[PDB]
Amino acid sequence: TVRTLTGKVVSDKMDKSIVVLIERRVQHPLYGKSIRRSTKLHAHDENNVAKIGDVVTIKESRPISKTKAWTLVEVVEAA
Amino acid sequence: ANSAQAKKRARQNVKARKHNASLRSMVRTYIKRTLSAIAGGDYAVATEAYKKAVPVIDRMADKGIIHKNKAARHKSRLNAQVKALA
Amino acid sequence: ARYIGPKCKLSRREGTDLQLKSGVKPFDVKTKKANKAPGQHGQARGGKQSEYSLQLREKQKVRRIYGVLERQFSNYYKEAARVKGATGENLLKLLESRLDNVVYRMGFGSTRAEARQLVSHRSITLNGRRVNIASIQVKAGDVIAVHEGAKQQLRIKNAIELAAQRGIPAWIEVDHSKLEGTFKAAPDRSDLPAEINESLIVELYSK
Amino acid sequence: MVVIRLARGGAKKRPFYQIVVTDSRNARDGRFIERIGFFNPTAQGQAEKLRLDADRFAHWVSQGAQPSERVASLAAQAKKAT
RNA sequence: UAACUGAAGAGUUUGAUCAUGGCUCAGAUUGAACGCUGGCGGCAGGCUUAACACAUGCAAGUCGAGCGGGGGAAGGUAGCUUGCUACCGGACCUAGCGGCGGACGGGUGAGUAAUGCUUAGGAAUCUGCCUAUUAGUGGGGGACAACAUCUCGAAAGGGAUGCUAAUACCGCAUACGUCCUACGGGAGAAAGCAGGGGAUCUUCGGACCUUGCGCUAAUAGAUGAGCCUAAGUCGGAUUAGCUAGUUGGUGGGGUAAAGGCCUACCAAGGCGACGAUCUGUAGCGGGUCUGAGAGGAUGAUCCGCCACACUGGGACUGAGACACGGCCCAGACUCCUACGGGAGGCAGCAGUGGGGAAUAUUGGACAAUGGGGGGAACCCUGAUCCAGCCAUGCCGCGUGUGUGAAGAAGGCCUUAUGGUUGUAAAGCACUUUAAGCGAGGAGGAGGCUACUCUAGUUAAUACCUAGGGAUAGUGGACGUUACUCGCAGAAUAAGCACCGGCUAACUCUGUGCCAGCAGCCGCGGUAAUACAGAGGGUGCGAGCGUUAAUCGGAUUUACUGGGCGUAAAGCGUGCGUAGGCGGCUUAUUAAGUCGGAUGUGAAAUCCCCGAGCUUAACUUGGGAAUUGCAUUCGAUACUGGUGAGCUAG
């Protein structure tokens, strides 16, 4: 019963943190053509398991730092 | 202040401020003594300082000078730091 | 407000009898200027008219018959358009449902103006209360009567005598002995005279 | 505290009250938690004079709401009528 | 049943014409303003500009049943210059300490493009008064206002010494819960007051019993608040790079609580063409106006959220404030002064000056609904309910009705005696709406006190609490109310714009490119239907016109719904980055797409059916709607992802 998201890791340099890029497809409000929107989320990786290019699942949690409020659940696909 | 009750509130505010400041400074002093003993590093001295400090923190927390969550935090953290000295 | 002034020139301009006078004498003998407009530049009815002129002149005739001013008439049109059914039929039913018109068609008033005067002066009771508003809508089953103080008035006897000559309407059931009638239902368009082309008023307001 | 009181609606000299559950600090005609009936002191003809939802009234009273004096009187009247 | 059903064109480029393309007009709407005119009622609205400066009054108090003092009226007994004096027991009042309130209610939109708002979720929190439940309320101590004395100052207000009460303050004791714990243990509260009473004692005046209001520790509920996440939320590239507590981690600090919130180290991270940074403008939403719809404009009055309180920076008290009518500091300004010293913040209500095209009374009552205090009686409340002013808007009503011609007079026109004003007027006969005078008269008031009885708790019939009954008092600002019944008399009541075409309504005099009119095309240079007056008419009507502003017509930024040979419009031509789109077959996935269910989408507003206002406006019951968002379960044709295969590109 927790909010999860699936995305691609685009950064793993910092300690215990990954940058996941989420993608969604929405309709333009007036012109009606489906377009692509992307958001960047900072997640928490306790053991630095995730790497650049993997497909990961993250879930909402209590804040861990200034910008991190999501935690890694599992690595669906490895680069 | 324009009204008599407002003036009375200001007077009571000053008096309560002095009293609360006294009690709060007492709490700070006892915590500082415990920290000084911990820095000294003797286990028995630190234990004695902590045992002296705890009742003051509890009494002032009960009077409302500090929150009981604050008192619990101080007690737990100081106890852990004392235990670290073995 | 309320129009006060010469009645017959209005009929002359409209080109038809508007029942503004009681009707003791015919309109032709009463005016002697029928078939001509009231202006010094007045002509016969055969002159050319634009569509706007026709639409305007149709609405003015109905307004002058019923004594209704422009704002109230526009409100009547809006209500008729909101209500489902034929818009012209709804408008004509709304006009005929007015209390002052119902009193006139009862015959206590020789003219709609006289009926309105009676209603305003509280000589008429709806159901059992002395109202004084001419524009009150009369519903099915309502009972209209004459107040006791207003009974025994030579104008009322003259009006009922003239109403005897006039065709008694079907939808209203009135006893003249005690001076009281019942509104049974709204008149139908077929019951109403056919010289009125309500479609012209409809196209006028629909623009 | 939570109270049950009347919120004034209607027009000039013809008030119409809604019976509402609300925090007592809110404005009389402003924010409220729940509406549980109405009161019309000058009703006539077919107009309903008082309507109160007894189930929600009892629920809020058990939760701790404090009815005003007029609302308590209206609740007594509604209980007598029903 | 019902909840909608909706789309008009015209004028103007030319000697004709068709097209293109601007400009202008017919509509709806307004917190409007101005000009002319002006009778009444109901319901609403009323500084949009200077978040400019403010005289004066009011807008926050209450509790003696928490406490000690201090007052001034009635009584009684004793003496007597005899109706005067001395003391004594009750009833009242409150400057001070103390409790609660003052963080609500009320005002404004300056700041704020996201620390805000809208929708949908979440975890690491606190929460006075209210409800339920559990364990208690034992015993001491030292002070300080008032008061007394001194002293400064005209005062206002200051400063210094000596006392005193408490539900003010601090130890000690005890601890069902509670906090810490190394799981052995350790730590921490509180206050009394009031009503009544059988028996007993009374060390002499209470103990004792009982019932309320209180106080302490804790767990739930309810309410309120704090924090976090995702999506959405106005322009500018003639602003392209921005950031070093900056991004992450560890130890420590800090908070009610997560967190660079803070700090010391370690690393080099973090944001940006899906617009970072900088910069202009702006409170946001429910809603409002317009539009067939899609869209566009807007955010007064009502409701929710946020922010601010002369301008900036802080903290105290408190459950809660970084506090409109509280404190400290700095700044500008204003006021009193006896030169010693002091005082202030209307964007609260009313009001003043100023600004402006323009927006009201220095009113009444707490009777009703609420809010604060109190056990209650009751007190406070510019919230509120009412009243005053204004045609500002909407709705309703009146200013009379019928008859009356061999067609009076007068006016205007004339082919000169007719036509028009016109049934119009006079005359005759009726009526009393509204306004005026007089007389009656609801409802907005549920209740409270007194009396009686019942049932609870108790030792009790007392007290307290909860109910019932009848009777009598008591309680309304509005207010001379709404409404009803009488009285006299047509008596008190009609204006404004326009008449060349667009666009309904035409002539005569005066003037002659003058005076003037004009939204556009255009009128006026002697017969002007276009200027001014008159007659007549037309459209509205207590209103009528003008100016300003928004949408529409405008398919004139074209998503719905336009164009680029010559009317405006294909880059001078290639290559190519990001991006957009992409051949055929097959398996799989379920992101796009589609369907179901659940939760939510506040109320008010719009629409429908009813109800009450003499009708209508207006008020109101219930629906419908809120076209959205989220979660979850399904479908697999098409698009996308993945695997395999193919040859027409």
Q: How far is the CA of C12 from the C1' of E538 (A)?
A: 15
Going by their DSSP bridges, the two strands D2-11 and D66-67 should be labelled as parallel
C1' of nucleotide E541: residue with nearest CA: C1
Q: Which two tokens stand for residue A36?
A: 């692509």
Q: At what angle do helices C70-82 and C51-66 cross, to 10 degrees?
A: 100
Number of domains in chain D: 1
* CB of D16 within 7 Å of some strand E atom: yes
Number of domains in chain B: 1
Domain spans of chain A? 1-79
Q: Which two tokens stand for residue B24?
A: 């709060």
Q: Is residue C56 helix, strand or coil? A: helix
- 8 Å CB contact between B75 and B55: no
For chain E, which bases have at least one atom within 7 A of a protein Cβ? 4, 8, 39, 42-44, 60-62, 95-102, 104-106, 121-126, 128-131, 169-172, 178-182, 186-190, 217-218, 221-224, 227-232, 247-250, 252-261, 267-272, 274, 295, 302-305, 316-319, 323, 325-327, 344-345, 368-372, 383-387, 395-404, 407, 412, 419-425, 429-434, 443-447, 467-468, 484-486, 494, 502-507, 535-542, 559, 579-581, 591-593, 602-603, 608, 611-616, 618-621, 631
* Domain C96-183 classification at class level: alpha beta
Determine the structural domain holding residue D78 and report its residue range. Answer: 1-82
* CB of B15 within 7 Å of some strand E atom: yes
Q: How far apart are CA A42 and CA A64, in angstroms?
A: 10
Maximum Cα–Cα distance across chain B? 61
Q: How far apart are CA C89 and CA B83, in angstroms?
A: 98
Determine the structural domain holding residue B10 and report its residue range. Answer: 1-86
Region C7-95+192-206: CATH code: 1.10.1050.10
Side-chain-side CA neighbours of residue C165 (13 Å): 10
Burial class of residue B46 (count of CB atoms within 10 Å of its CB; 0-12, 13-18, 19+): buried
Burial class of residue C198 (count of CB atoms within 10 Å of its CB; 0-12, 13-18, 19+): buried
Resolution value, angstrom units: 2.2
Strand order in the sheet with D14-23: D50-52, D34-39, D14-23, D2-11, D66-67
* CB of D45 within 7 Å of some strand E atom: yes
Determine what percent of chain D falls in helix, strand and coil, rounding each to the nearest 5: 30, 40, 35
- 8 Å CB contact between D21 and D4: yes
Q: How far apart are CA C10 and CA C57, in angstroms?
A: 11
